[PDB]
Ligand binder design. Structure first.
Ligand SMILES: CNc1cc(Nc2c(F)c(F)cc(F)c2F)nn2c(C(=O)NC[C@@](C)(O)CO)cnc12
Ligand SMILES: [Mg+2]
Ligand SMILES: [Zn+2]
Length: 326
Protein backbone atom coordinates (compact mmCIF):
# COMPACT_ATOMS: atom_id res chain seq x y z
CA UNK A 1 0.00 0.00 0.00
CA UNK A 2 1.11 3.55 -0.97
CA UNK A 3 2.62 5.91 1.60
CA UNK A 4 0.52 9.05 2.39
CA UNK A 5 3.08 11.27 0.52
CA UNK A 6 2.96 8.72 -2.46
CA UNK A 7 -0.91 8.96 -2.49
CA UNK A 8 -0.79 12.84 -2.59
CA UNK A 9 1.75 12.43 -5.48
CA UNK A 10 -0.61 9.94 -7.30
CA UNK A 11 -3.45 12.50 -6.97
CA UNK A 12 -1.25 15.32 -8.45
CA UNK A 13 -0.30 12.95 -11.31
CA UNK A 14 -4.01 12.68 -12.31
CA UNK A 15 -3.44 16.07 -14.11
CA UNK A 16 -0.64 14.58 -16.32
CA UNK A 17 -2.90 15.10 -19.39
CA UNK A 18 -3.53 18.79 -18.51
CA UNK A 19 -1.66 21.98 -19.49
CA UNK A 20 -0.69 23.61 -16.19
CA UNK A 21 0.32 20.51 -14.17
CA UNK A 22 1.75 21.42 -10.68
CA UNK A 23 5.27 20.29 -11.75
CA UNK A 24 7.01 22.07 -8.77
CA UNK A 25 4.65 20.34 -6.28
CA UNK A 26 5.40 16.97 -8.06
CA UNK A 27 9.17 17.75 -7.74
CA UNK A 28 8.74 18.26 -3.93
CA UNK A 29 6.32 15.28 -3.44
CA UNK A 30 8.51 12.80 -5.40
CA UNK A 31 11.65 13.71 -3.40
CA UNK A 32 13.19 15.56 -6.40
CA UNK A 33 12.20 12.85 -8.91
CA UNK A 34 9.76 14.77 -11.21
CA UNK A 35 11.41 13.38 -14.39
CA UNK A 36 11.31 9.73 -13.23
CA UNK A 37 7.67 9.89 -11.93
CA UNK A 38 6.26 11.92 -14.85
CA UNK A 39 8.05 9.76 -17.50
CA UNK A 40 6.93 6.51 -15.75
CA UNK A 41 3.29 7.81 -15.64
CA UNK A 42 3.41 8.80 -19.35
CA UNK A 43 4.99 5.46 -20.44
CA UNK A 44 2.21 3.56 -18.53
CA UNK A 45 -0.53 5.91 -19.89
CA UNK A 46 0.65 5.42 -23.52
CA UNK A 47 1.34 1.64 -23.03
CA UNK A 48 4.98 2.15 -24.20
CA UNK A 49 6.42 -0.57 -21.89
CA UNK A 50 4.16 -3.25 -23.47
CA UNK A 51 4.54 -1.94 -27.09
CA UNK A 52 8.37 -1.75 -26.96
CA UNK A 53 8.87 -4.63 -24.44
CA UNK A 54 10.62 -2.30 -21.93
CA UNK A 55 11.32 -4.08 -18.58
CA UNK A 56 9.86 -1.84 -15.82
CA UNK A 57 13.07 -2.09 -13.63
CA UNK A 58 15.15 -1.12 -16.73
CA UNK A 59 12.90 1.94 -17.35
CA UNK A 60 13.08 3.10 -13.68
CA UNK A 61 16.91 2.57 -13.49
CA UNK A 62 17.44 4.55 -16.74
CA UNK A 63 15.07 7.39 -15.67
CA UNK A 64 16.81 7.74 -12.28
CA UNK A 65 20.23 7.69 -14.03
CA UNK A 66 19.06 10.28 -16.61
CA UNK A 67 17.56 12.49 -13.87
CA UNK A 68 20.81 12.18 -11.80
CA UNK A 69 22.72 13.70 -14.79
CA UNK A 70 20.63 16.93 -14.64
CA UNK A 71 22.39 19.38 -12.26
CA UNK A 72 20.60 20.13 -8.95
CA UNK A 73 22.65 23.39 -8.57
CA UNK A 74 21.39 24.77 -11.98
CA UNK A 75 18.29 27.00 -11.34
CA UNK A 76 16.47 26.48 -14.66
CA UNK A 77 18.10 23.79 -16.92
CA UNK A 78 17.57 20.95 -14.42
CA UNK A 79 15.32 17.82 -14.01
CA UNK A 80 12.20 19.99 -13.25
CA UNK A 81 12.56 21.72 -16.65
CA UNK A 82 13.08 18.27 -18.35
CA UNK A 83 9.93 16.83 -16.60
CA UNK A 84 7.97 19.97 -17.69
CA UNK A 85 9.07 19.68 -21.36
CA UNK A 86 8.19 15.92 -21.30
CA UNK A 87 4.69 16.59 -19.86
CA UNK A 88 4.09 19.56 -22.23
CA UNK A 89 5.10 17.36 -25.26
CA UNK A 90 2.76 14.60 -23.93
CA UNK A 91 -0.20 17.10 -23.89
CA UNK A 92 0.74 18.50 -27.38
CA UNK A 93 0.91 14.92 -28.81
CA UNK A 94 -2.75 14.39 -27.68
CA UNK A 95 -4.09 17.47 -29.55
CA UNK A 96 -7.28 16.60 -31.65
CA UNK A 97 -5.76 17.94 -34.91
CA UNK A 98 -2.95 15.29 -34.55
CA UNK A 99 -5.17 12.26 -33.58
CA UNK A 100 -3.79 8.98 -35.13
CA UNK A 101 -1.15 10.97 -37.11
CA UNK A 102 2.00 9.63 -35.33
CA UNK A 103 3.16 6.01 -34.82
CA UNK A 104 4.08 4.62 -31.36
CA UNK A 105 7.81 4.92 -32.35
CA UNK A 106 7.42 8.63 -33.30
CA UNK A 107 5.57 9.20 -29.98
CA UNK A 108 8.41 7.38 -28.10
CA UNK A 109 10.97 9.54 -29.98
CA UNK A 110 9.27 12.89 -29.06
CA UNK A 111 8.92 11.88 -25.37
CA UNK A 112 12.49 10.43 -25.09
CA UNK A 113 13.95 13.49 -26.93
CA UNK A 114 12.08 15.81 -24.47
CA UNK A 115 13.44 13.85 -21.46
CA UNK A 116 17.13 14.05 -22.53
CA UNK A 117 17.03 17.42 -24.40
CA UNK A 118 18.99 19.39 -21.68
CA UNK A 119 20.75 16.55 -19.77
CA UNK A 120 24.07 17.59 -18.10
CA UNK A 121 23.40 21.30 -18.82
CA UNK A 122 26.12 23.33 -16.93
CA UNK A 123 23.87 26.43 -16.61
CA UNK A 124 25.93 28.44 -19.16
CA UNK A 125 25.41 29.28 -22.83
CA UNK A 126 27.16 27.75 -25.86
CA UNK A 127 28.99 31.11 -26.34
CA UNK A 128 30.45 31.01 -22.77
CA UNK A 129 31.73 27.45 -23.52
CA UNK A 130 33.20 28.61 -26.85
CA UNK A 131 34.89 31.77 -25.40
CA UNK A 132 36.56 29.79 -22.53
CA UNK A 133 37.93 27.11 -24.97
CA UNK A 134 36.09 24.42 -22.96
CA UNK A 135 36.78 20.75 -23.85
CA UNK A 136 33.04 20.47 -24.86
CA UNK A 137 33.36 23.32 -27.43
CA UNK A 138 36.61 21.69 -28.72
CA UNK A 139 34.92 18.24 -29.06
CA UNK A 140 31.89 19.74 -30.91
CA UNK A 141 33.68 22.36 -33.04
CA UNK A 142 31.73 25.29 -31.44
CA UNK A 143 28.50 23.98 -33.22
CA UNK A 144 25.34 23.25 -31.13
CA UNK A 145 27.84 22.36 -28.35
CA UNK A 146 25.25 21.81 -25.58
CA UNK A 147 22.61 20.17 -27.83
CA UNK A 148 25.20 17.67 -29.19
CA UNK A 149 26.31 16.94 -25.59
CA UNK A 150 22.70 16.47 -24.30
CA UNK A 151 22.18 13.83 -27.02
CA UNK A 152 25.53 12.05 -26.46
CA UNK A 153 24.86 11.84 -22.66
CA UNK A 154 21.20 10.72 -23.12
CA UNK A 155 22.33 7.85 -25.37
CA UNK A 156 25.55 7.03 -23.38
CA UNK A 157 23.49 6.53 -20.19
CA UNK A 158 21.70 3.54 -21.89
CA UNK A 159 25.02 1.64 -21.43
CA UNK A 160 24.98 1.85 -17.61
CA UNK A 161 23.95 -1.25 -15.54
CA UNK A 162 20.32 -2.28 -16.45
CA UNK A 163 19.68 1.01 -18.34
CA UNK A 164 19.07 -0.17 -21.94
CA UNK A 165 15.37 0.65 -22.33
CA UNK A 166 15.68 -0.04 -26.13
CA UNK A 167 17.14 -3.58 -25.67
CA UNK A 168 14.09 -5.26 -27.30
CA UNK A 169 13.74 -2.89 -30.29
CA UNK A 170 14.88 -4.22 -33.70
CA UNK A 171 17.90 -2.58 -35.41
CA UNK A 172 15.43 -0.86 -37.86
CA UNK A 173 13.35 0.54 -34.89
CA UNK A 174 16.55 1.74 -33.08
CA UNK A 175 17.96 3.50 -36.20
CA UNK A 176 14.63 5.21 -36.91
CA UNK A 177 14.14 6.22 -33.22
CA UNK A 178 17.79 7.41 -32.99
CA UNK A 179 17.51 9.58 -36.15
CA UNK A 180 14.23 11.19 -34.91
CA UNK A 181 15.63 11.87 -31.39
CA UNK A 182 18.76 13.54 -32.90
CA UNK A 183 16.70 15.69 -35.36
CA UNK A 184 14.46 16.79 -32.45
CA UNK A 185 17.17 17.66 -29.83
CA UNK A 186 19.38 19.47 -32.40
CA UNK A 187 16.26 21.59 -33.31
CA UNK A 188 16.18 22.83 -29.62
CA UNK A 189 19.28 25.03 -30.33
CA UNK A 190 17.89 28.64 -30.48
CA UNK A 191 20.24 29.39 -33.44
CA UNK A 192 17.84 27.10 -35.45
CA UNK A 193 14.60 28.89 -34.30
CA UNK A 194 14.10 31.28 -37.31
CA UNK A 195 14.60 28.52 -39.94
CA UNK A 196 12.38 26.08 -37.97
CA UNK A 197 9.59 28.74 -37.73
CA UNK A 198 9.92 29.69 -41.46
CA UNK A 199 9.40 25.99 -42.44
CA UNK A 200 6.46 25.62 -39.98
CA UNK A 201 4.86 28.77 -41.62
CA UNK A 202 5.41 27.17 -45.11
CA UNK A 203 3.65 23.98 -43.91
CA UNK A 204 0.72 26.03 -42.46
CA UNK A 205 0.31 27.77 -45.90
CA UNK A 206 0.09 24.41 -47.81
CA UNK A 207 -1.70 22.53 -44.94
CA UNK A 208 -3.61 19.36 -45.97
CA UNK A 209 -6.26 17.77 -43.70
CA UNK A 210 -7.90 14.29 -43.92
CA UNK A 211 -7.00 15.99 -38.68
CA UNK A 212 -3.56 16.83 -40.23
CA UNK A 213 -2.15 14.86 -43.20
CA UNK A 214 1.70 14.31 -43.10
CA UNK A 215 2.91 12.19 -46.05
CA UNK A 216 6.77 12.20 -45.89
CA UNK A 217 9.50 11.98 -43.13
CA UNK A 218 10.47 15.65 -43.82
CA UNK A 219 6.93 16.87 -42.89
CA UNK A 220 6.53 14.47 -39.95
CA UNK A 221 9.92 15.34 -38.36
CA UNK A 222 9.29 19.13 -38.89
CA UNK A 223 6.02 18.89 -36.86
CA UNK A 224 7.80 16.81 -34.12
CA UNK A 225 10.77 19.26 -33.97
CA UNK A 226 8.36 22.27 -33.72
CA UNK A 227 6.23 20.47 -31.15
CA UNK A 228 9.19 19.80 -28.75
CA UNK A 229 10.52 23.34 -29.51
CA UNK A 230 7.01 24.67 -28.50
CA UNK A 231 7.16 22.47 -25.31
CA UNK A 232 10.66 23.90 -24.57
CA UNK A 233 9.29 27.48 -25.09
CA UNK A 234 5.96 26.77 -23.23
CA UNK A 235 6.61 28.55 -19.89
CA UNK A 236 4.96 31.91 -21.02
CA UNK A 237 1.85 29.92 -22.13
CA UNK A 238 1.33 28.40 -18.67
CA UNK A 239 -0.78 29.86 -15.76
CA UNK A 240 1.04 32.97 -14.39
CA UNK A 241 1.84 31.22 -11.01
CA UNK A 242 3.91 28.62 -12.98
CA UNK A 243 5.42 31.11 -15.53
CA UNK A 244 6.69 33.47 -12.76
CA UNK A 245 8.58 30.55 -11.12
CA UNK A 246 10.19 29.69 -14.52
CA UNK A 247 11.14 33.38 -15.01
CA UNK A 248 12.74 33.59 -11.50
CA UNK A 249 14.74 30.42 -12.27
CA UNK A 250 15.99 31.48 -15.76
CA UNK A 251 16.92 34.98 -14.40
CA UNK A 252 18.83 33.39 -11.48
CA UNK A 253 20.65 31.16 -14.03
CA UNK A 254 21.37 34.13 -16.41
CA UNK A 255 22.59 36.33 -13.47
CA UNK A 256 24.93 33.54 -12.25
CA UNK A 257 26.43 33.40 -15.79
CA UNK A 258 26.82 37.23 -15.80
CA UNK A 259 28.63 37.03 -12.40
CA UNK A 260 31.00 34.43 -13.94
CA UNK A 261 31.54 36.58 -17.07
CA UNK A 262 32.15 39.70 -14.89
CA UNK A 263 34.74 38.05 -12.57
CA UNK A 264 36.56 36.71 -15.71
CA UNK A 265 36.64 40.12 -17.46
CA UNK A 266 34.34 38.86 -20.25
CA UNK A 267 31.55 40.87 -21.90
CA UNK A 268 28.32 40.21 -19.95
CA UNK A 269 25.77 38.34 -22.13
CA UNK A 270 22.30 39.88 -22.80
CA UNK A 271 19.99 39.64 -19.69
CA UNK A 272 22.89 38.34 -17.52
CA UNK A 273 23.80 41.60 -15.73
CA UNK A 274 21.97 41.69 -12.34
CA UNK A 275 23.07 45.40 -12.02
CA UNK A 276 21.57 46.42 -15.43
CA UNK A 277 18.52 44.13 -15.67
CA UNK A 278 14.91 44.63 -16.94
CA UNK A 279 13.18 41.28 -16.12
CA UNK A 280 9.77 42.56 -17.36
CA UNK A 281 11.14 44.11 -20.63
CA UNK A 282 13.09 40.87 -21.26
CA UNK A 283 9.88 38.77 -20.89
CA UNK A 284 7.81 41.07 -23.21
CA UNK A 285 10.68 40.88 -25.76
CA UNK A 286 10.99 37.05 -25.50
CA UNK A 287 7.18 36.75 -25.98
CA UNK A 288 6.93 39.34 -28.82
CA UNK A 289 9.91 38.19 -30.88
CA UNK A 290 10.11 34.42 -30.15
CA UNK A 291 7.28 32.74 -28.18
CA UNK A 292 4.17 34.49 -29.69
CA UNK A 293 5.32 34.12 -33.38
CA UNK A 294 6.02 30.39 -32.74
CA UNK A 295 2.80 29.59 -30.78
CA UNK A 296 0.63 31.68 -33.22
CA UNK A 297 1.97 29.51 -36.12
CA UNK A 298 1.45 26.28 -34.05
CA UNK A 299 -2.14 27.47 -33.20
CA UNK A 300 -2.76 27.91 -36.98
CA UNK A 301 -1.46 24.36 -37.70
CA UNK A 302 -3.72 22.76 -35.03
CA UNK A 303 -6.61 25.35 -35.24
CA UNK A 304 -8.60 25.68 -32.92
CA UNK A 305 -6.87 23.31 -30.40
CA UNK A 306 -4.25 25.82 -29.10
CA UNK A 307 -6.72 28.81 -28.63
CA UNK A 308 -6.67 28.75 -24.77
CA UNK A 309 -2.81 28.35 -24.72
CA UNK A 310 -2.53 31.39 -27.07
CA UNK A 311 -5.03 33.36 -24.84
CA UNK A 312 -2.96 32.62 -21.67
CA UNK A 313 0.22 33.68 -23.56
CA UNK A 314 -1.42 37.04 -24.53
CA UNK A 315 -2.68 37.54 -20.91
CA UNK A 316 0.82 36.79 -19.46
CA UNK A 317 2.38 39.23 -22.00
CA UNK A 318 -0.02 42.04 -20.81
CA UNK A 319 0.74 41.21 -17.16
CA UNK A 320 4.48 41.71 -17.81
CA UNK A 321 3.80 44.79 -20.01
CA UNK A 322 1.78 46.43 -17.15
CA UNK A 323 4.69 45.52 -14.71
CA UNK A 324 7.43 47.48 -16.65
CA UNK A 325 8.54 50.38 -14.33
CA UNK A 326 8.17 53.86 -15.97
C1 LIG B 1 10.78 31.60 -18.65
N1 LIG B 1 11.60 32.49 -19.44
C2 LIG B 1 12.57 32.10 -20.37
C3 LIG B 1 12.91 30.82 -20.74
C4 LIG B 1 13.90 30.62 -21.84
N2 LIG B 1 14.27 29.31 -22.20
C5 LIG B 1 15.39 28.94 -23.01
C6 LIG B 1 16.71 29.26 -22.67
F1 LIG B 1 16.95 29.92 -21.53
C7 LIG B 1 17.78 28.87 -23.44
F2 LIG B 1 19.02 29.24 -23.06
C8 LIG B 1 17.61 28.12 -24.58
C9 LIG B 1 16.33 27.78 -24.92
F3 LIG B 1 16.11 27.02 -26.02
C10 LIG B 1 15.24 28.19 -24.18
F4 LIG B 1 14.01 27.85 -24.58
N3 LIG B 1 14.50 31.63 -22.51
N4 LIG B 1 14.15 32.91 -22.09
C11 LIG B 1 14.62 34.11 -22.62
C12 LIG B 1 15.47 34.26 -23.84
O1 LIG B 1 15.67 35.36 -24.34
N5 LIG B 1 15.92 33.13 -24.38
C13 LIG B 1 16.46 32.97 -25.72
C14 LIG B 1 18.02 32.91 -25.76
C15 LIG B 1 18.72 34.12 -25.16
O2 LIG B 1 18.35 31.71 -25.05
C16 LIG B 1 18.39 32.77 -27.25
O3 LIG B 1 19.76 32.40 -27.30
C17 LIG B 1 14.02 35.09 -21.87
N6 LIG B 1 13.19 34.54 -20.93
C18 LIG B 1 13.26 33.23 -21.08
MG1 LIG C 1 18.56 23.29 -24.47
ZN1 LIG D 1 15.10 23.03 -22.48
Amino acid sequence: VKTEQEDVLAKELEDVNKWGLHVFRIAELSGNRPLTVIMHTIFQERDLLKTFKIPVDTLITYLMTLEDHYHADVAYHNNIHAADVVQSTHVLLSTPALEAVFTDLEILAAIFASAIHDVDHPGVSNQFLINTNSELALMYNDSSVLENHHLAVGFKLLQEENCDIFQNLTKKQRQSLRKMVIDIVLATDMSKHMNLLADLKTMVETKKVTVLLLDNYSDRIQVLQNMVHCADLSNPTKPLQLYRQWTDRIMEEFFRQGDRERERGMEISPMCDKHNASVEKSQVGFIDYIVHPLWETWADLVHPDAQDILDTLEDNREWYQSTIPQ
